[model samples]
Target chain A: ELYRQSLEIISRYLREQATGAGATSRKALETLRRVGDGVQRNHETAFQGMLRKLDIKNEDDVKSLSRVMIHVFSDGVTNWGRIVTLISFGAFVAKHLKTINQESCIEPLAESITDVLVRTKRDWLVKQRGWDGFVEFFHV
Target chain B: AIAEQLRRIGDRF
Candidate 1:
């Protein structure tokens, strides 16, 4: 529920900002919003499975893998949002893992999350191409 | 024992 709310807020902000003064800005914003929506959906889907596996009891209980996955997912959500979350999660997980004794799990989890993100991005690019081709054909 | 296992499990992520 909270995750959904966060996405909604993000979408709302994007929509509000997309309709600004310049044509180029509007187009860029629209593209960004579309990408953001795609990322949100992927994140939600991926997070659902991870959440179940981890039995995440609360926001705080979300582990390193979940955090990194979410961070990468969010980056894939919005191009800009990606940098912050990536750095933040990377630092947080690396620093805290020793204390938590979860050091061994980080590498495999990071690799898996990276794999998922790469595949998701490829799927998104394919869909975008198909959509563009369809729209061009319709216009012609 | 559990903590060690948990540690190992956590490390796998």
Candidate 2:
């Protein structure tokens, strides 16, 4: 339930601030896309370059890869901007998977992001009032 | 709402 709320806040931020038509401000679009591009490229390098290839071919891949991403990189990070980027990056990858005909991978990817956040950031989440804080931080 | 919005923004990517 909390994860669903978090996802809604995140998706609204991205749909409004990250897309071309709905984007409200130049700075918002630039900042959001900068985070998005960094996460996608870093994940490509971190997962595929050194340890695992993580093509995101299926649900299991999404789960394991997302787990590794949050656990490895976001373990100690407490900033909300980075957290938002992590979720948005998952959305970015979901679109790629869909383009490649792996639509089944999207939900698992979303769930994995939620699980990872809940696992590693539970205390921070609660302190920030869970997804409510997310809304406060990203409100246009 | 959550899933659909996610997929919609995902499509934009």
Candidate 3:
């Protein structure tokens, strides 16, 4: 539901970080942005629902919430900020499918999402200023 | 460059 996914955010960050990028990264970012838009346009409700279910209220909760998010983007996403963008997309997809079933459950996705939260990387979480940063990033 | 930006993205979140 959010603009710019983790992949796009990360790519944008990389583009900025690199002092600029060529076609490779630019096109990549553009494609990802399109995907993000589609997710939001199609799964807005489920996306919001998922976030509500998480119900992140404070710093501690944010970290826990972040942990769950990290699992979604864990494929090769080691960057903390990038994970932010990733979660926006992940949450959307998770909820989108939940809606697809016309049920209130995310089933296995929720299971795996929650399952990884506990095992999420604590060190990186700390690096992102832990809950404080996450709260700000997530606009808590 | 990437490492620093990555760190900044997290720190500057």
TM-score for the B chain of model 2: 0.68
The list of candidate 3 runs beyond 4 A from truth reads A1-8, A11-21, A57-60, A70-87, A90-140, B1-13
Ranking by TM-score: 2, 3, 1
Between prediction 1 and prediction 3, the one with superior lDDT is: 3
Q: What is the lDDT of residue A2 in candidate 1?
A: 24
Model 2 error, position A59 (Å)? 2.1
Q: Across residues A72-99, which tens digit of lDDT does each residue of candidate 2 receive?
A: 4433435666565566566566666666
Give the Cα error of residue A123 in candidate 1, in Å.
6.1
Over A1-140, each residue of candidate 1 has an lDDT whose tens digit, in order, gives 32232233333333242222133334433443454444434444443454345442332453444444544454234233342223223323333433455545444333433443345454553454422322232231
State the weakest 10-residue window (summed lDDT) of model 2 chain A: A16-25
Per-residue lDDT tens digits for candidate 3, residues A84-103, read: 44433344544344344422
Model 1 residue A53 lDDT score: 54
Ranking by lDDT: 2, 3, 1
TM-score of chain A of each: 0.32, 0.62, 0.37
